[PDB]
């Protein structure tokens, strides 16, 4: 899939913006879900509004033709929904449209074909009913992990685009629950909490990487996924965060070598909820949220702008594997 | 050789990669491991 290196650099770009936004808190997000939502939205935009979005997702538009971007997403999404038998992985997209809104037919055709979007009509005027239809859809897609996503919803909303993934993978070799023991986790130099620390003696793809000043551990899932964990040496977290690139990840993923190691990894459950406007603005995605946004590819009835772009993601790690689910909620109003 | 011990008991970064596409499905950093 040819949009991959673009998505990997978009992950590191967005990560760095979120870390600079709040540098001492948990971070968890889905680069693929956000890139899917905004690439789908770009089908309804024109001119610089459009180009800012795809460039912000790290596409060069004078290098990759736009048809190939969208077909790249179309295939990505199809692969995501056809995992190996041992991995649970799904994704979907719902486009909740104001009842009565006259759309540009080509938009509705393109989101259905390229992004597999399920279109629904709703009355944003009945705020409790519209919130329930969106939140039920997200709760179903995320298999119960993101509940009551939308709490407040503008009566003048023209559309809400909602994109999710569901992930549940099993470690290729699970931890034994009997071996999990409470240990100290050093949040910072003056703060220690207790955590259930899982452990196993195993053959791991594990190395200490000079360029990152970090241990680098690959944890294979059964089926078509791997988790890569980076443990920075003392004082080196910011350095590690700055120095990750797609070429570095690729080199780690391509190496087959394993060595005997005693791994201790915490069981955990974390969540991120993010307003993406400012961070995506730092990535250059600005006009689509503004009083100049050109969403005339969506509707020619009246100008729009994107009012809201929120991302929520949940992660659970335990002895069996990992479960994770993001959702994007991108809402447009008349401008 | 004595097997190394690698213990995730301080902040760490991670990424989850889908194997067919190599796409980054998730990225994060754990600073405080909630339960």
Describe the structure.
The complex is a heterodimer of chains A (335) and B (35). Chain A is an alpha+beta fold and 335 residues long. Chain A is built from nine helices and twelve strands. Chain A folds into two domains: 240 residues, 2-Layer Sandwich (Antithrombin, Chain I, domain 2), CATH 3.30.497.10; 95 residues, Roll (Alpha-1-antitrypsin, domain 1). Chain A has a six-stranded mixed sheet, sandwiched between helices. In chain A, strands 5, 6, 7, 8 and 9 form a five-stranded antiparallel sheet that branches. In chain A, a hairpin with a 2-residue loop joins strand 5 and strand 6. The longest helix of chain A is centred in the N-terminal third of the chain and has 18 residues. Chain A starts with a helix and ends with a strand. Chain B has one domain: Serpins fold. In chain B, 0% of the residues lie in helices and 49% in strands. Chain B has no helices and three strands. In chain B, strands 2-3 form a two-stranded antiparallel sheet. In chain B, a hairpin with a 5-residue loop joins strand 2 and strand 3. Chain B is flat. Classes of the chains: A alpha+beta (335), B mainly beta (35). At the A-B interface, helix 1, strand 1, helix 4, strand 5 and strand 6 of A face strand 1, strand 2 and strand 3 of B. It is classed as hydrolase inhibitor. Keywords: serpin, hydrolase inhibitor.
CATH homologous superfamily caption of the largest domain in chain A: Antithrombin, subunit I, domain 2
**End-to-end separation of chain A:** 37 Å
Biggest sheet, spatial arrangement of strands of chain A: 3-2-4-12-11-10
State the helicity of chain B in percent bands: under 10%
Distance between the termini of chain B: 36 Å
What is the number of domains of chain A? 2
State the CATH architecture of chain B. Ribbon
Please report the two chains with the greatest interface, counting residues with C-beta closer than 8 angstroms to the partner's C-beta.
A-B, 71 and 34 residues
- CATH class assignment of the largest domain in chain A: Alpha Beta
CATH topology term of chain B = Serpins fold
PDB class: hydrolase inhibitor
Keywords: serpin, hydrolase inhibitor
Assembly: dimeric
Entry title: Cleaved antitrypsin with P10 Pro, and P9-P6 Asp
